[PDB]
């Protein structure tokens, strides 16, 4: 039984070895390097007195939400530096926040094991709690809106769930990860999502069937971050061994490895530009390094965050990049 | 700017005033982390001080606001969410003295006292808690007295050769918890044998928190 499982794993590894014929770094030699990419701060955003953990971009690319330890979800106006909403929180400890695609709802989650959905287009004028999602035995680490009625959450009890917001209960349960699931991202077609856990594995999931499609085991220690490529066939992954790895769904193997000698700090977040050519990551050495999808070098350096970088996300159209740090400031990099 | 842009800037300044007021209220309040095993007596010490996510307890003693966060409900891996609690005033670590005879009910192969020693070793030597003091509580001291009278301490830990005495065994277990600290200069261990009286239990926390605030004020002034 266990020996048969080891033989099947050996067979899958042999199939992965047989599939690969050419290294991707040899193929990308033809395309030119991007050169130095210099980004200057456009806006300096304030109003947080506590540690920022997460930020989700709006679809219109102007609105953004931010999660902090002051008990506040503060929705901002990126262009005019105004504060659109300020949501008082019941649980101070928050580790994630999501913005709906329609713009109607805002989620948050953390150590209280409760996902709170906040309505923004109410007639009363105050952002109140619409639905409290409960039933997690572990801390919520990431949540993303599929729709105004569906949301996919990652939790600390090794269980990812799909939530019917109108019903208030979970529809599809996803299990199989050894260790808590640190993050998740949604594909553009929204029919599949991939989540990385702390057994150095990232498992592709299907919303409809509910069974695990693929699993990649190219990481040494653990996964803090995961983000899809814009086409929906690739995803770069962030880890604590100072490496970033790119995995192809169709090829079912590791495309590229990102590493550099003096950097030993872990990766908190990764993101992609509009084209997908630029891979932007967040590190623990107070420095954000912009990478290249094909050439695998460093295109730019983002600095100016006093405390450790919690999160980083590139907006929908690609006009701006706002980086989340623990110094209670979000800075917008164009 | 248009009229709606001016009114939006006015709304943003009112939100800035509300956030400044809430931050000034939150900066004064003292945050305390509650740690230990489930059967250590967290509920008992919390209900004494008052008179499955994070249980938050608010109580005020001598014009000082306290936040206590009970993390015992979560069953997840602690290493991934322990970095959130970096900016905390002190660590309240509660264990029971009577745990040495009671074998753990997980594998029935390890004493609970040594599991609590490993728990204190993981908390004290954490990279995120370097200048955060640990407020140690030793629970069930009367049951520890009856248990030490019935059964000697020597059976749980073979190396200890001290005589069967309540005060001697209590001082040795206190020194055994103090020995686990590897950075003694920047990290205090405040040990109190938990009594029935609520006032002494709250007073000990107030004294330890007051000493930590004195240390932090010395850090800010820079004399320390």
């Amino acid at each position: 039984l266990r020996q048969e499982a080891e033989q099947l794993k050996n067979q899958i590894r042999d199939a992965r070895k047989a599939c690969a014929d050419a290294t991707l770094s040899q193929i990308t030699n033809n395309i030119d390097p991007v050169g130095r990419i210099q980004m200057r701060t456009r806006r300096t955003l304030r109003g947080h007195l506590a540690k920022i953990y997460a930020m989700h971009w709006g679809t219109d690319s102007r609105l953004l939400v931010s999660a902090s330890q002051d008990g506040k979800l503060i929705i901002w106006d990126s262009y005019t530096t105004n504060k659109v909403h300020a949501i008082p929180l019941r649980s101070s400890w928050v580790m994630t926040c999501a913005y709906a695609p329609s713009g109607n709802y805002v989620a948050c989650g953390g150590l209280d094991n409760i996902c709170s959905i906040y309505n923004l287009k109410t007639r009363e004028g105050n952002v109140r709690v619409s639905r409290e999602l409960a039933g997690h035995t572990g801390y919520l680490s990431c949540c993303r809106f599929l729709d105004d009625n569906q949301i996919v959450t990652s939790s600390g009890d090794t269980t990812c769930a799909l939530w019917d917001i109108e019903t208030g209960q979970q529809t599809t349960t996803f299990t199989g990860h050894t260790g808590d699931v640190m993050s998740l991202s949604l594909a553009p077609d929204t029919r599949l999502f991939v989540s990385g856990a702390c057994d150095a594995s990232a498992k592709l999931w299907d919303v409809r069937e509910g069974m695990c499609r693929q699993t990649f085991t190219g990481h040494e220690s653990d996964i803090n971050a995961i983000c899809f490529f814009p086409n929906g066939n690739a995803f770069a992954t962030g880890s604590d061994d100072a490496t970033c790895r790119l995995f192809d769904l169709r090829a079912d193997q590791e495309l590229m490895t990102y590493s550099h000698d003096n950097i030993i700090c872990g990766i908190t977040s990764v993101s992609f530009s509009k084209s997908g050519r630029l891979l932007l990551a967040g590190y623990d050495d107070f420095n954000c390094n912009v990478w290249d999808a094909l050439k695998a070098d460093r295109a730019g350096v983002l600095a100016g965050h006093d405390n450790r970088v919690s999160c980083l996300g590139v907006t929908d159209d690609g006009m701006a990049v706002a980086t989340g740090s623990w110094d209670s400031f979000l800075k917008i990099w164009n | 700017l248009s009229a709606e842009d001016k009114a939006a800037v006015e709304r943003s300044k009112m939100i800035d005033r509300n956030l400044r007021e809430d931050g000034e209220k939150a900066a004064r309040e003292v945050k305390l982390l509650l740690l230990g095993a489930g059967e250590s007596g967290k509920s008992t010490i919390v209900k004494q001080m008052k008179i499955t996510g994070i249980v938050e307890t608010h109580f005020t003693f001598k014009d000082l606001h306290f936040k206590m966060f009970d993390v015992g409900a979560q069953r997840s891996e602690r290493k991934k969410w322990i970095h959130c609690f970096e900016g905390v005033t002190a660590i309240i670590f509660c264990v029971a003295l009577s745990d040495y005879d009671l074998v753990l009910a997980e594998d029935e192969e390890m004493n609970r006292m040594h599991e609590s020693m490993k728990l204190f070793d993981s908390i004290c030597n954490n990279k995120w808690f370097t200048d955060t003091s640990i407020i140690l509580f030793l629970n069930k001291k009367d049951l520890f007295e009856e248990k030490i009278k019935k059964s000697p301490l020597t059976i749980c830990y073979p190396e200890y050769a001290g005589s069967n005495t309540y005060e001697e065994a209590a001082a040795y277990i206190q020194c055994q918890f103090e020995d686990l600290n590897k950075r003694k200069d920047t990290k205090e261990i405040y040990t109190h044998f938990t009594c029935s009286t609520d006032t002494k239990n709250v007073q000990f926390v107030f004294d330890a928190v007051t000493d930590v605030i004195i240390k932090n004020n010395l850090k800010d002034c820079g004399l320390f």
Partner: single-chain antibody
Amino acid sequence: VQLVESGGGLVQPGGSRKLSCSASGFAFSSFGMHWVRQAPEKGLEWVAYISSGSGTIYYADTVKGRFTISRDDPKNTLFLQMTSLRSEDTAMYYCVRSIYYYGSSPFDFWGQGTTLTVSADIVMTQATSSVPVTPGESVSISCRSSKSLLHSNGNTYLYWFLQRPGQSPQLLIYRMSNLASGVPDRFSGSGSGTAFTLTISRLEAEDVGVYYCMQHLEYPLTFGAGTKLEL
């Protein structure tokens, strides 16, 4: 969400009267408050504005000085103080809540209106006055301005209202690109600076009323004459 006004009746000229509007079902402290007056045989007219937290206060030039506006947030009551009333103040006064942020819909909820009878600048121009229409055909309503409302940020501050006969007016279209919450897809706004067009496909008997075009580019707020439809 409900706003009711009290303090009406007959007022002698030169006297004083203090109105009070009570708010229920919404957070009164977060909305800016407008007063809008309506003559019996003429269109609507703006009176005054107070912001949330009483940060800024605006008046029209014809009503400046005589009228005093205040608000009390713990009591959720809007107060209008009137001193030295004249013969032109015989109008029905409305209370309006208005939140201001990016994507907000101000002028969304209108009060009921209190009757006050006394006994002795961007000019918005309605080209038409009354158009006889039939239920089913498309209805075209045009409004014109004295100043280009296209601001440099891209927003065009023109609001469309419908005042049904015997009922309070409601917002239809705000900022000419967005439909108000609760308004069907039958209404649509189009046009550019100084030339605007309103189109109503699938005409309904409830849609029949008085149509107002309102600018919000600068204070004082000046309204339209009012395009009324009939059957």
